[PDB]
């Protein structure tokens with residue numbers, strides 16, 4: 001029995017060991033309570049405004065659309081404290097942890113951005129934070145590992161399985177199953193068992209609410225489409241949610257195409273995987289023919305979650321949202337173009353969303369369209385990766 | 397078939413607990429795994445619980461995580477595990493054989509088709525580790541349609557609603573993991589499948605204790621796997637140590 005529906009059509013659910021069900025039910029009840037509590041909402045609003053820096057700008061891009069009938073805005077989650085959208089919902093989940101009388105936080109991270117957000121929220125709010133991270137990810141994300149550690153979090157390398165994000169997700173669930181009386185599991189995306197897809201959406205939905213108010217103020221109408229990258233689905237559902245009932249507004253999610261869909265070296269399970277059951281949910285998966293879970297490949301570290309949030313799978317199935325992919329090379333070009341033409345260095349994850357908007361523009365340059373790209377993070381963290389690629393090619 | 401019903405009736409005749417070892421199929425290789433399993437049976441195992449290697453065993457601790465890694469290193473697949481199950485049943489007609497599965501492996505090629513293959517090879521029960529009773533309906537229904545017992549865990553944080561559900565939904569045995577006497581007597585009150593204690597069963601005294609508390613027996617969830625891990629370099633010593641261990645654990649069920 002739950003208070004809220006755990007499914008989005010056929011997708012979602014609570015596929016955890018029975019031992020974890022009380023933890024999920026407790027969290028759902030606390031969330032439902034919190035959402036009706038003006039005091040909780042005021043504390044959340046205060047952290048968002050005065051600590052994280054909301055509202056974030058909506059920037060009209062002055063140069064990249066020249067000579068076309070596209071008007072492109074960027075929702076600037078790159079300017080949030082921590083440098084990505086991840087900060088929004090960590091602040092809400094840390095408050096839920098306190099509401100439940102928890103003193104400890106567990107989080108998983110792949111690229112390290114969710115880990116940093118979890119660490120900063122835990123430091124501010126007096127929670128003891130431990131972060132599981134695949135050993136392969138720890139090795140390749142020493143800067144983020146160090147930030148997490150500077151902020152007082154314990155970073156625990158995970159050596160089981162593939163030593164990547166999925167394996168870290170498993171370890172976090174294993175810990176929580178034993179520790180949930182005192183620890184909260186701060187899941188980093190709009191996936192996993194109910195109630196996480198619901199909570200993460202509601203704690204990211206200010207992205208879309210602000211975008212709607214800003215675009216109305218500036219243009220006097222809604223956007224033709226809003227465009228966001230999809231790793232597990234949090235920044236995209238945060239942008240989408242407030243527009244779902246505005247049926248004229250396109251909702252476009254961009255999965256990583258990696259080396260190309262046809263190579264199989266990609267991270268686009270929603271359109272190119274197969275429904276399975278893993279990490280607490282029924283959703284499209286990267287998986288072998290005989291049902292072993294596989295990794296997502298992308299140049300971008302943060303588009304590594306090898307499934308996708310069940311609400312995206314649902315929105316796709318009913319035709320409300322459309323999902324596409326963008327390759328490594330397309331993302332890299334969009335990165336370079338935004339740096340040179342707008343003076344904004346975008347995360348490589350976000351660069352996938354931008355690349356698809358640039359394609360919408362360039363393919364049909366006389367089509368009038370008002371687009372918003374969710375710029376989920378800044379790309380400082382990516383300049384070494386980009387540097388190394390541009391040298392290898394011989395561009396530098 | 398009625399393999400659990402027949403086993404418990406026979407054990408009840410002999411005032412005896414069941415002892416049930418867990419091992420991972422294909423660990424550390426197919427051949428050696430087959431020999432390991434025949435050694436457990438020869439040594440007195442009353443039933444088997446057998447894991448199929450899965451990439452992401454999110455209900456398992458390190459011992460079993462490492463068993464999965466060894467089996468993968470040997471290239472073991474679910475198809476090979478089912479070939480193994482058919483051979484095991486062909487050798488041993490009455491021993492109850494239970495699988496411990498992850499949901500994706502059951503769902504992958506169709507839930508119904510999974511249970512139909514279980515029936516074809518002679519499996520008696522399936523515990524799906526990441527399916528709580530709340531999500532269990534299509535699994536239990538397919539199990540029962542194919543003469544397979546669906547096995548549920550009654551965890552340490554179980555409440556009355558859960559006890560009633562597990563009692564109603566489960567068959568074969570209840571996997572027991574609030575006072576222990578309370579859970580066991582409540583399960584009997586609710587006409588649940590006989591309870592096997594599965595929490596940290598690694599020594600003879602724990603087998604005796606489970607029976608004394610009123611459980612029908614005990615499941616060693618990882619102790620057998622630990623013996624495999626420790627004896628990898630010595631296949632013959634591995635079998636000897638497995639024999640000694642299972643013999644001792646079974647002796648304790650009297």
Ligand SMILES: Cc1ncc(COP(=O)(O)O)c(/C=N/[C@@H](CO)C(=O)O)c1O
Nearest residue numbers: 110111113114231232233234235302377
């Ligand atoms: C700047 C940025 N944009 C988008 C995404 C994509 O995640 P959603 O789809 O918005 O949930 C991420 C993800 N990062 C995770 C996984 O490695 C993490 O840090 O742990 C990110 O860091």
Ligand code: NA
Nearest residue numbers: 065066068070
């Ligand atoms: Na223009």
Ligand code: NA
Nearest residue numbers: 231232305307
């Ligand atoms: Na994904």
